[PDB]
């Protein structure tokens, strides 16, 4: 079921962030300090896609006071897959695991993910069949 899991730390190039530790399960580090603009790619690490069709992008977030949003990518910024605003979980190390679906294409993919608005914390991203 599971495409890949993708530490949010292990990015090959990223604007605007630090990595910082995670009390989360597994612990680990999160990404932080994310604000509007910043941004992280994964283009290092490419994912394979096995078929044309739906899949389910999952998300570990933290957020203190909520307000944030995503967009999933490629990294390089086109196309873009999709968006999803990040709850108030209730703190910085308070974790929850948001999701959406996107269509994605077969073949090799380059992710990536731009803040639109901060206030919250990244640990991983998984990419799973629907
Ligand atoms: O998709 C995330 C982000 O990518 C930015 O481009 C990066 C790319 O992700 C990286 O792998 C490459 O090596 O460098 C460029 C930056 O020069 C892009 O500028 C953003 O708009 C986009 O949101
Ligand atoms: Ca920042
Ligand atoms: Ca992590
Ligand atoms: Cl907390
Ligand atoms: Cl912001
Ligand atoms: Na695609």
Redesign the pocket.
């Given at each position: 079921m599971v495409i890949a899991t993708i530490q949010a730390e292990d990015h090959?190039?990223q604007?605007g962030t630090q990595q910082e530790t995670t009390t989360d399960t597994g612990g680990g580090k999160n990404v932080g300090y994310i604000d509007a603009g910043d941004?992280?790619?994964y283009?290092?690490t490419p994912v394979n896609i096995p078929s044309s069709g739906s899949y389910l992008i999952e998300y570990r977030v933290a957020s203190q006071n909520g307000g944030g949003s995503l967009?999933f990518?490629?990294?390089?910024?086109a196309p873009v897959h999709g968006t999803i605003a990040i709850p108030a979980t209730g703190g910085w190390q308070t974790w929850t695991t948001i999701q959406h679906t996107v269509n994605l294409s077969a073949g090799s993919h380059?992710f990536?993910?731009?803040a639109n608005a901060g206030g919250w914390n990244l640990n991983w991203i998984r990419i799973n069949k629907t």
């Open positions: 090959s190039q604007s941004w992280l790619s283009a290092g967009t990518e490629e990294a390089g910024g380059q990536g993910i731009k």
